[PDB]
Amino acid sequence: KLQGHDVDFLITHPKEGQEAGLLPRVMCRLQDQGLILYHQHQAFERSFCIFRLPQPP
DNA sequence: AAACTATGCATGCTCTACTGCTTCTGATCTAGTCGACT
Ligand SMILES: Nc1ncnc2c1ncn2[C@H]1C[C@H](O)[C@@H](COP(=O)(O)NP(=O)(O)OP(=O)(O)O)O1
Numbered sequence: 001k002l003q004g005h006d007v008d009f010l011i012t013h014p015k016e017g018q019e020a021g022l023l024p025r026v027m028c029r030l031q032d033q034g035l036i037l038y039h040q041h042q043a044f045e046r047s048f049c050i051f052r053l054p055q056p057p
Numbered sequence: 058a059a060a061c062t063a064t065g066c067a068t069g070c071t072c073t074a075c076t077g078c079t080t081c082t083g084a085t086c087t088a089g090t091c092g093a094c095t
């Protein structure tokens with residue numbers, strides 16, 4: 001598809017047994033960066049958000 | 058020699074405080090239902 005309504009990703013680690021708490025850390029880091037308008041919760045393995053994309057113009 | 062007053066005792070009622078036991082209430086928590094999303 002060339003058009004959509006959302007962008008969906010899947011995060012994994014080829015090595016077994018390391019992504020115990022990956023998502024909270026990445027989400028909080030992005031929030032510190034200042035891009036998440038909405039976090040589903042503001043250990044979980046799923047979340048939907050509303051990113052803040054800066055357009056080139 | 059008699060009357061007044063200092064001293065004390067015995068008892069009931071009341072404020073005040075303190076310690077301990079029991080019960081009630083505010084606060085900390087899992088099941089059911091509807092709804093959101095993917
Ligand atoms: N009700 C459901 N039942 C089963 N699987 C589902 C599902 N809803 C989603 N999935 C699975 C399959 C879906 O591909 C994926 C999430 O896809 P989306 O972001 O909800 N819709 P997409 O991005 O594909 O299209 P568009 O750009 O037009 O909005 O999760």
Ligand SMILES: [Mg+2]
Nearest residue numbers: 005006007008
């Ligand atoms: Mg999507």
